[PDB]
Amino acid sequence: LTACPEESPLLVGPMLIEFNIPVDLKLVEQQNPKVKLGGRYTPMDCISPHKVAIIIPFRNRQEHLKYWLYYLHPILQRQQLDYGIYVINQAGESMFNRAKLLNVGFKEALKDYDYNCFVFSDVDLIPMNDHNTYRCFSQPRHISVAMDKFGFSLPYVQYFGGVSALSKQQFLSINGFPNNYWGWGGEDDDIYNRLAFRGMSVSRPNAVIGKTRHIRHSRDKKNEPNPQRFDRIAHTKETMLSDGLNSLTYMVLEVQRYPLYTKITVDIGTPS
Numbered sequence: 001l002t003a004c005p006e007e008s009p010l011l012v013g014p015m016l017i018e019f020n021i022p023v024d025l026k027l028v029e030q031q032n033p034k035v036k037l038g039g040r041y042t043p044m045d046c047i048s049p050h051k052v053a054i055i056i057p058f059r060n061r062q063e064h065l066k067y068w069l070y071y072l073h074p075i076l077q078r079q080q081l082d083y084g085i086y087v088i089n090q091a092g093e094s095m096f097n098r099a100k101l102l103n104v105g106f107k108e109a110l111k112d113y114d115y116n117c118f119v120f121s122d123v124d125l126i127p128m129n130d131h132n133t134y135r136c137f138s139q140p141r142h143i144s145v146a147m148d149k150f151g152f153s154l155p156y157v158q159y160f161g162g163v164s165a166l167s168k169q170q171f172l173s174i175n176g177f178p179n180n181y182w183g184w185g186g187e188d189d190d191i192y193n194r195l196a197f198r199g200m201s202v203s204r205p206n207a208v209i210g211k212t213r214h215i216r217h218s219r220d221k222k223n224e225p226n227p228q229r230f231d232r233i234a235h236t237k238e239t240m241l242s243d244g245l246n247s248l249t250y251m252v253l254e255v256q257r258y259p260l261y262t263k264i265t266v267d268i269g270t271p272s
């Protein structure tokens, strides 16, 4: 086997993405036979240098997940990546903590395979063009740059939410993501600040290839806007050394391998 081509030849470009067609995971699996237990896939006809762990923060979003799986697996295989899907499920009914869930995902995934790239994706975001590769780059990568919920515009140049990817070393170099952001908002801005403070820039696909669709939904109870988010992101400089991968604590309650993804239910504590 030889190293895969820089740009995969199975790419079709823009795709039709819609969510009023409720799916069947059984069909998904039948339609994606190369997907090994736990949502794992390795190209059989070339060597991909991208060992990608896709981490999805999760809590009561099965319907979104189904659509996510229906759409990304065929896409990811055409992108010729050697990947695994990790749904990090917050146990309990306390305040949601997206970023801490993403950290847990980084550590747990590494216990399965030697991934060197991490794609952090909201459960409700689907790329509209398979040319927007779900891999890592020389600089941190903002993948969902043109979301339809933002009329295909970046809400602001430093926006880093939705879907992003960090090589294993870029992630480590910033001490991971913060574990101290409970509730909705700001966590993505803190992460951006970290990348900046570490002297890194953000890489992005053009607005066309980066178009992506957001599954319309209402606010979830227990993930209400975090009023402390403004003060927190204003002090990332002072807190990233101690709040991160080095101070991460959690309790894996269960690991389930579904045919299309691995579900890790974890207890990540409460607002300290």
Ligand SMILES: O=c1ccn([C@@H]2O[C@H](COP(=O)(O)OP(=O)(O)O[C@H]3O[C@H](CO)[C@H](O)[C@@H](O)[C@H]3O)[C@@H](O)[C@H]2O)c(=O)[nH]1
Pocket: 056, 057, 058, 059, 060, 061, 096, 098, 121, 122, 123, 124, 125, 161, 162, 163, 183, 184, 185, 186, 187, 188, 219, 220, 221, 223
């Ligand atoms: O009860 C919940 C709350 C959140 N999530 C997960 O966390 C993600 C973000 O939560 P929401 O989609 O409600 O939030 P938004 O659509 O506003 O998400 C946007 O703003 C967020 C504020 O924290 C994140 O920064 C972000 O990635 C961005 O896409 C979801 O995609 C999902 O993966 C759940 O599974 N269950």
Ligand SMILES: [Mg+2]
Pocket: 122, 124, 214, 217
């Ligand atoms: Mg959303």
